[PDB]
Scaffold this active site. Structure first.
Site, PDB file in Angstrom:
ATOM      1  N   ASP A 130       0.834  -1.196   0.000  1.00 58.39           N
ATOM      2  CA  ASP A 130       0.000   0.000   0.000  1.00 58.39           C
ATOM      3  C   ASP A 130       0.872   1.251   0.000  1.00 58.39           C
ATOM      4  O   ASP A 130       0.577   2.234   0.688  1.00 58.39           O
ATOM      5  CB  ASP A 130      -0.966   0.009   1.189  1.00 58.39           C
ATOM      6  CG  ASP A 130      -2.123   0.995   1.012  1.00 58.39           C
ATOM      7  OD1 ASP A 130      -2.348   1.484  -0.118  1.00 58.39           O
ATOM      8  OD2 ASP A 130      -2.809   1.281   2.014  1.00 58.39           O
ATOM      9  N   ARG A 134      -0.250   9.250   0.227  1.00 58.58           N
ATOM     10  CA  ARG A 134      -0.990   9.459   1.467  1.00 58.58           C
ATOM     11  C   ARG A 134      -0.356   8.726   2.643  1.00 58.58           C
ATOM     12  O   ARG A 134      -0.543   9.145   3.790  1.00 58.58           O
ATOM     13  CB  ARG A 134      -2.444   9.019   1.299  1.00 58.58           C
ATOM     14  CG  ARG A 134      -2.601   7.537   1.067  1.00 58.58           C
ATOM     15  CD  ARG A 134      -4.029   7.164   0.732  1.00 58.58           C
ATOM     16  NE  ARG A 134      -4.124   5.750   0.392  1.00 58.58           N
ATOM     17  CZ  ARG A 134      -3.889   5.254  -0.816  1.00 58.58           C
ATOM     18  NH1 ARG A 134      -3.575   6.037  -1.835  1.00 58.58           N
ATOM     19  NH2 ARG A 134      -3.967   3.940  -1.005  1.00 58.58           N
ATOM     20  N   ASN A 135       0.395   7.654   2.386  1.00 57.73           N
ATOM     21  CA  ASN A 135       1.027   6.851   3.425  1.00 57.73           C
ATOM     22  C   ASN A 135       2.504   7.192   3.627  1.00 57.73           C
ATOM     23  O   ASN A 135       3.278   6.334   4.063  1.00 57.73           O
ATOM     24  CB  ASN A 135       0.873   5.364   3.105  1.00 57.73           C
ATOM     25  CG  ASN A 135      -0.573   4.929   3.064  1.00 57.73           C
ATOM     26  OD1 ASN A 135      -1.378   5.339   3.902  1.00 57.73           O
ATOM     27  ND2 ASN A 135      -0.916   4.095   2.084  1.00 57.73           N
ATOM     28  N   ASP A 148       1.773   3.118   7.637  1.00 58.08           N
ATOM     29  CA  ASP A 148       0.523   2.436   7.333  1.00 58.08           C
ATOM     30  C   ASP A 148       0.824   1.036   6.844  1.00 58.08           C
ATOM     31  O   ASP A 148       0.796   0.760   5.641  1.00 58.08           O
ATOM     32  CB  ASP A 148      -0.304   3.205   6.301  1.00 58.08           C
ATOM     33  CG  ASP A 148      -1.769   2.785   6.298  1.00 58.08           C
ATOM     34  OD1 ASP A 148      -2.052   1.589   6.524  1.00 58.08           O
ATOM     35  OD2 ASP A 148      -2.646   3.651   6.087  1.00 58.08           O
TER      36      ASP A 148
HETATM   37  C1  LIG Z   1      -2.309  12.638   5.324  1.00 57.39           C
HETATM   38  C2  LIG Z   1      -3.052  12.745   6.494  1.00 57.39           C
HETATM   39  C3  LIG Z   1      -2.413  12.953   7.776  1.00 57.39           C
HETATM   40  O1  LIG Z   1      -1.543  12.172   7.946  1.00 57.39           O
HETATM   41  N1  LIG Z   1      -2.597  14.169   8.574  1.00 57.39           N
HETATM   42  C4  LIG Z   1      -1.772  14.617   9.703  1.00 57.39           C
HETATM   43  C5  LIG Z   1      -0.895  13.765  10.358  1.00 57.39           C
HETATM   44  C6  LIG Z   1      -0.134  14.205  11.440  1.00 57.39           C
HETATM   45  N2  LIG Z   1       0.811  13.326  12.151  1.00 57.39           N
HETATM   46  C7  LIG Z   1       0.795  11.853  12.111  1.00 57.39           C
HETATM   47  N3  LIG Z   1       1.793  11.197  12.668  1.00 57.39           N
HETATM   48  C8  LIG Z   1       1.839   9.871  12.663  1.00 57.39           C
HETATM   49  C9  LIG Z   1       0.808   9.149  12.064  1.00 57.39           C
HETATM   50  C10 LIG Z   1      -0.224   9.880  11.489  1.00 57.39           C
HETATM   51  C11 LIG Z   1      -1.423   9.197  10.790  1.00 57.39           C
HETATM   52  C12 LIG Z   1      -2.674   9.817  10.547  1.00 57.39           C
HETATM   53  N4  LIG Z   1      -3.447   8.900   9.921  1.00 57.39           N
HETATM   54  C13 LIG Z   1      -2.760   7.701   9.735  1.00 57.39           C
HETATM   55  C14 LIG Z   1      -3.161   6.478   9.131  1.00 57.39           C
HETATM   56  C15 LIG Z   1      -2.268   5.404   9.067  1.00 57.39           C
HETATM   57  C16 LIG Z   1      -0.975   5.538   9.601  1.00 57.39           C
HETATM   58  C17 LIG Z   1      -0.589   6.749  10.190  1.00 57.39           C
HETATM   59  C18 LIG Z   1      -1.486   7.844  10.264  1.00 57.39           C
HETATM   60  C19 LIG Z   1      -4.844   9.153   9.490  1.00 57.39           C
HETATM   61  C20 LIG Z   1      -5.085  10.627   9.265  1.00 57.39           C
HETATM   62  C21 LIG Z   1      -4.682  11.448  10.460  1.00 57.39           C
HETATM   63  C22 LIG Z   1      -3.234  11.240  10.869  1.00 57.39           C
HETATM   64  N5  LIG Z   1      -0.195  11.196  11.538  1.00 57.39           N
HETATM   65  C23 LIG Z   1      -0.257  15.534  11.852  1.00 57.39           C
HETATM   66  O2  LIG Z   1       0.508  16.004  12.934  1.00 57.39           O
HETATM   67  C24 LIG Z   1      -0.001  17.201  13.489  1.00 57.39           C
HETATM   68  C25 LIG Z   1      -1.136  16.402  11.203  1.00 57.39           C
HETATM   69  C26 LIG Z   1      -1.896  15.941  10.129  1.00 57.39           C
HETATM   70  N6  LIG Z   1      -2.834  16.848   9.430  1.00 57.39           N
HETATM   71  C27 LIG Z   1      -2.388  17.625   8.260  1.00 57.39           C
HETATM   72  C28 LIG Z   1      -4.224  16.968   9.913  1.00 57.39           C
HETATM   73  C29 LIG Z   1      -5.176  16.184   8.964  1.00 57.39           C
HETATM   74  N7  LIG Z   1      -5.969  17.130   8.154  1.00 57.39           N
HETATM   75  C30 LIG Z   1      -6.328  16.509   6.870  1.00 57.39           C
HETATM   76  C31 LIG Z   1      -7.196  17.469   8.891  1.00 57.39           C
END
Ligand SMILES: *CCC(=O)Nc1cc(Nc2nccc(-c3c4n(c5ccccc35)CCCC4)n2)c(OC)cc1N(C)CCN(C)C
Length: 280
Positions: A130, A134-135, A148
């Site tokens: 995957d 996005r990951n 992920d």
């Molecule tokens: C691309 C989306 C996203 O990652 N947004 C985000 C992420 C972080 N920090 C962070 N750190 C470690 C892991 C993750 C994360 C998130 N998601 C996943 C899924 C699978 C594996 C890891 C993982 C799902 C979506 C939320 C985060 N994320 C961060 O640090 C402040 C800030 C963001 N944003 C930009 C906020 C999301 N926005 C679209 C509302």
């Protein structure tokens, strides 16, 4: 070889809790005693548990500067995954949001770092299944990591999904290899060079298998010289063993990152806090 990775179990009273669809949260991990505050991301039915524990199994077994590190799990109502917080988000949203500021140096260096992380996953005999923009999260604009592992598999090919990132062999027969990951790497590089465009935008996923069989691929991005687009096209060969290896992709993009404007034509080119990478 025996997998002597250490599964660390965290007290819920050591957190101080971003994205839902489960739910991922942000917080501080303060291990009792050591005066230290780790910025973490906390990801909160029997199936789910088996799957979070499978993902937790994988992340606990990898350790590389370009692979997201696992800090531990917390055993509550539903199991929580605790990982390093990546402050700048996923790379797909980042290149979209900063479209007017991504230079060729950053683009080519991300390509080097992703291939390094994927090359390491290949060393661990691990198929990501995957890989996509996005990951890939962003620790700093100068440092990205792969994440992920919900679909990841450990090999002793694999016989089993996002259709627009997987190789033709993965779509027709459900076969996955490190060389099918190279295909996903190609789509991921395309995503970056197009500053976040959607692959095959508008084409439903059901005709993708027909399009790729007849010989069609993703278009050449505007900023891309033929040198960079050629590498992408090589990742999309029908014959999987004709596609490049991640160790070669590292070498190729490394050379390009020493003269970035030759390959990418872009217009106008809290005190005890400790990042997880320094808390070993
Ligand atoms: C691309 C989306 C996203 O990652 N947004 C985000 C992420 C972080 N920090 C962070 N750190 C470690 C892991 C993750 C994360 C998130 N998601 C996943 C899924 C699978 C594996 C890891 C993982 C799902 C979506 C939320 C985060 N994320 C961060 O640090 C402040 C800030 C963001 N944003 C930009 C906020 C999301 N926005 C679209 C509302």
């Amino acid at each position: 070889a025996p997998n002597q990775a250490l599964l660390r179990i965290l007290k819920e009273t050591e957190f101080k809790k971003l994205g839902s669809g489960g739910t991922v949260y942000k917080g501080l991990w303060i291990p009792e005693g050591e005066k230290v505050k780790i910025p973490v991301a906390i990801k909160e039915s029997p199936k789910a548990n088996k799957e979070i524990l499978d993902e937790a199994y994988v992340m606990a077994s990898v350790d590389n500067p370009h692979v997201c590190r696992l800090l531990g799990i917390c055993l509550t109502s539903t199991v929580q995954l605790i990982t390093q917080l990546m402050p700048f988000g996923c790379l797909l949203d980042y290149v979209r949001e900063h479209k007017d500021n991504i230079g060729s140096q950053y683009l080519l260096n991300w390509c080097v770092q992703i291939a390094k992380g994927m090359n390491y996953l290949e060393d661990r005999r691990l198929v990501h299944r995957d890989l996509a923009a996005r990951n890939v999260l962003v620790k700093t604009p100068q440092h990205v990591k792969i994440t992920d592992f919900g679909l990841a598999k450990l090999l002793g090919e694999y016989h089993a999904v996002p259709i627009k990132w997987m190789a033709l062999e993965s779509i027709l027969h459900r076969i996955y290899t490190h060389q099918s990951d190279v295909w996903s790497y190609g789509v991921t590089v395309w995503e970056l060079m197009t500053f976040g465009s959607k692959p095959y935008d508008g084409i439903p996923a059901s005709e993708i298998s027909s399009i790729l069989e007849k010989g069609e691929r993703l278009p050449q991005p505007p900023i891309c010289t033929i040198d960079v687009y050629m590498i992408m096209v090589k990742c999309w060969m029908i014959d999987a063993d004709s596609r490049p290896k991640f160790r070669e992709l590292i070498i190729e993009f490394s050379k390009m990152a020493r003269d970035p404007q030759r390959y990418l034509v872009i217009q106008g080119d809290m005190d005890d806090v400790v990042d997880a990478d320094e808390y070993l």
